[PDB]
Every structure is written in structure tokens, then in C-alpha cells.
């Protein structure tokens, strides 16, 4: 794709079409649902899962103790550094996973559509298909709704695709 | 006319559920357990050398409590302190008990 569509506010992935009977835009549903479920599961794993810790060691000091103070400070600083590293890595990994699954859902929808219309259309390359027949808004609906029968328009397309 | 050819991957009737990044639970053909939880209930006498210390804490063997005489001059790799142990001799206490115990153990 070259950019995103801002006017889409009832979904995340969508089709845009321009046939002789007008231009239109309609968002795909189940792709967005499958992309929302995964992010919600991610959050449910992350948020609200905090364990209890009641009595710990002291971590501030107003008196020069000597050795035991050194040890306690070292323990706490070590734990803090390790947990911060784990946190940064976890956040980076989960964000990469979010990006990956979103890209995967977009490309999955694209390939599903491409495989629906076997030879009746062509891959222009820019995230848009070139249909090679007259396709009313009901034909586009049958595209998105999944009930597009390729054998119907097939021959027509081939003619207009080769002659 | 023409033929057909499908691509597929095997499956099983009864798989096992595992955890991943995407799905907290997802089924697979087979999975092995990485968290050991089964204990056979007894201490194997090899390859590490063992001293049972039946009725004797390591300190009583050190000072040489009269019941703790079978341990004289003995060596070990692991000393198994029993909870039933006691001391049947003259009372005493040890400043920094744990420290002496740990260094004698090592």
C-alpha cells in the first residue's frame, strides 16, 4: 500500500472500489475481529497480573553501616537492573508481535481475496486489484461476503484480459 | 479432463495443550514436560558420597558426642541432617552456629 485510509471508522481493514456505478468503501469485519482478540489477550496477560510481596529488606539508609549495607544495596540494585532489562525486552518483543500480527492479517485478507477471483482479475501491485469485467455493487458484495462465483464472469474477463 | 491434488498436514485425535505468545492455550500433536515435579521419595547413594548422621547433627559429630562416634575421621560429599537428631551429652551453645556448620560442611 502507499498509505492508510482515515475515513474508515467502523473497522481496521477495508476494501475501496470504483466501478461504473460509483465509488465506495467498506471495511472487512472478521479480520478486524481476529486482530482485536489477539491484542485483548495480550493485554489480559499483561494488565492486572501483579503478585503480592509483604515484608522485604530495607532499601534506604540513614546510618553508615559498613558491609551489610553494601550487600543489601547490591542485591536490590542487581534485582532492579535485571527486572528493567526484562521489562524493556518484553515490551519490545510484544510490540514487534503486535506489528507482525497486524501486517499478517492485512496480507491474509489480501491473499484470500486474490485467491477468490482466480483469473478474472490481476495484481496491479499497489494493494489494488484490476477487475476485468463489469461488476456491480452486488458483485463486489459477493466478493467481500465470500460468495463470489468465479465461473460466472470467468470467460468475459479472459476475453477482456487477452483480446 | 483434469485431476485434483490437495496439500495437507497430519493431525491426531488426542493432542496436548500448550502456551505460546499468540494463544495462551493452543493444541498440538505432542508436547514434553519441562518442569520436573515427580520425586521418587528417597536419596540415591551415588555418585556423591553420603553420611546419614542418623541421630547426630554435624556439630555433635564434630565435638564427638558419645553416640556420634561412628563418624570419627569420616569424609563426605553430602551430610543428611535428620530432624529426629538430638544431643545426649553435656549442654552447650555455639556463637555463630550456622557459620561453623557451613564451613565444616564445605
Amino acid at each position: 500500500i502507499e498509505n492508510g485510509w482515515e475515513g474508515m471508522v467502523d473497522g481496521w481493514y477495508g476494501f475501496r472500489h470504483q466501478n461504473s456505478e460509483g465509488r465506495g468503501q467498506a471495511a472487512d469485519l472478521k479480520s478486524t475481529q481476529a486482530a482485536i482478540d489477539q491484542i485483548n489477550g495480550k493485554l489480559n496477560r499483561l494488565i492486572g497480573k501483579t503478585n503480592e510481596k509483604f515484608h522485604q529488606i530495607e532499601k534506604e539508609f540513614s546510618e553508615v553501616e559498613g558491609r551489610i549495607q553494601d550487600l543489601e544495596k547490591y542485591v536490590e540494585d542487581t534485582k532492579i537492573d535485571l527486572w528493567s532489562y526484562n521489562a524493556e525486552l518484553l515490551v519490545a518483543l510484544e510490540n514487534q508481535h503486535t506489528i507482525d500480527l497486524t501486517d499478517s492479517e492485512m496480507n491474509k485478507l489480501f491473499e484470500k481475496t486474490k485467491k477468490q477471483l482466480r483469473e478474472n482479475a490481476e495484481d496491479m501491485g499497489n494493494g489494488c486489484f484490476k477487475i476485468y469485467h463489469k461488476c456491480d455493487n452486488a458483485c463486489i458484495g459477493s466478493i467481500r461476503n465470500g460468495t463470489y462465483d468465479h465461473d460466472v464472469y470467468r470467460d468475459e474477463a479472459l476475453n477482456n484480459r487477452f483480446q | 479432463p483434469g485431476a485434483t491434488l490437495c496439500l495437507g498436514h497430519h493431525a491426531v485425535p488426542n493432542g496436548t495443550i500448550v502456551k505460546t505468545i499468540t494463544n495462551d492455550q493452543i493444541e498440538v500433536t505432542n508436547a514434553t514436560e519441562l518442569v520436573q515435579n515427580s520425586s521418587i521419595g528417597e536419596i540415591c547413594d551415588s555418585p556423591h558420597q553420603i553420611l546419614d548422621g542418623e541421630n547426630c547433627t554435624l556439630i555433635d559429630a564434630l565435638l564427638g558426642d558419645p553416640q556420634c562416634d561412628g563418624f570419627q575421621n569420616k569424609k563426605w560429599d553430602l551430610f543428611v541432617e535428620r530432624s529426629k537428631a538430638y544431643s545426649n551429652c553435656y549442654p552447650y551453645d555455639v556463637p555463630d552456629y550456622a557459620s561453623l556448620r557451613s564451613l565444616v560442611a564445605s
Partner: antibody
Amino acid sequence: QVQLLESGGGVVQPGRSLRLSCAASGFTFSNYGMHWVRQAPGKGLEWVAIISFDGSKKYYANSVKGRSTISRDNSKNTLSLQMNSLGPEDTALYYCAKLPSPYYFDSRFVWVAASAFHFWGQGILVTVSS
Amino acid sequence: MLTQPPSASGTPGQRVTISCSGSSSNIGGNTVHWFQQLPGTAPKLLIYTNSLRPSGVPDRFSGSKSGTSASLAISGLQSEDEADYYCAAWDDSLNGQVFGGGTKLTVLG
């Protein structure tokens, strides 16, 4: 938590019409799509109807299709259900509830969350007989 | 309309599973969810999105979905979990939320 009051229970003579109204407070009604489910005494859970967060999409059960109606008011924070042509198979407890559902029934603001807002109300009992 | 067996049984701490089977329309094409009905009370939402538990729910409950087969496992099952358990999911053909038959489990008495 959330506090709702449920009105419209009782006994409706056969062939007549009911009127249930669930009115809640303590959360943002405007965001969540609602459900009506029914439970025949004895046992069983039968879904009835569903309405979005604006009223755009209203969907009904095949068992009551064409003879029931759902509605909502967002200024009064009220959900309501109507059903006519009642028989003995309709006498039941009626729960107003936010069920997990496809996302477009909920607001744009509450598609993604870690809590997944949910609640059921107590039953509203309606019985049909002389 | 959803094949959920009538009864389940177990012993305190036996991790019993309740099954659910649907069609290519409802479960194969949409996530599932699970409710618990304690006698004389409204169903509480146990599980949603086939594995997810809300704020109040323990971790003893687990779930899964494979094609047209949903599973609700209870690991640390105990005295106060004897209730009715319902599997439910959204079906596109009927454009509606179809429930399950229901299940009542008992424990080792």
C-alpha cells in the same frame, strides 16, 4: 460496581404482550451493546435479542423473529424489550446482560481493553396463564 | 443448538473438562465463551475469547478452541464449583448468539 434496576415482571395472559426495561448506572452505557437472554424454569438458556451501542444494528432470535422488538435510550440509560403473542414456551426469566460479542456492537473506544466489561442482571420473571 | 454433554463428574482436584461442539458457521468462524450458573443466581462470565478470564475469575479455569471444538478445563476443582456450565458463541448465518445445551457437574461425594 454497576447497579441496575429491572422492571416489568409478572404474569401476562396468553396471546398478550410483555414489557421489560433494564436501567443501569455506574458505567458508560453509551459504549456497550446489550443482550436479552431468557431461561425457561427447569433448565435451558435461550438467547433472545441483541442491540448495538447506538441502535444501528438490532438482531433477534429465530424463535421470536417477527414478533418481538428491542430498544434503548441513552439519555435515560435504559434498555427495553417488547414481545407479543406469548405462549407457555415463553414464560421464563429474562436477563439483560452485556455478553462478549463481535466488536462492532461496542463503541470505538471500548474495542480493546484488558478487562472485557461484562455483567448479567437478576432474572425478570414473566409467566403466562389464566 | 450446541452439543454440550448433559453431565460431568470428578473428585476434588481432578481437572475435569467440559466439551462443546458447533458447526463451521459459529465456532469455526468466531470465538467462544463460557458462563457459570450457580443455583438461584444469574450466570457469571467465566471465559471469553476461548482462553481469557476477566478480572474476578481465578486461574483454575482454562479453555481452548480447535476448529469446531471448544474445551473448558477446570484444574483445581473443589467443593464450591458444583453448578451449571454453558458454552456459547456467535454464528454469522443466523447473525446471532447461539448458546449451548448445558452441563451440570458433580464432585466426589
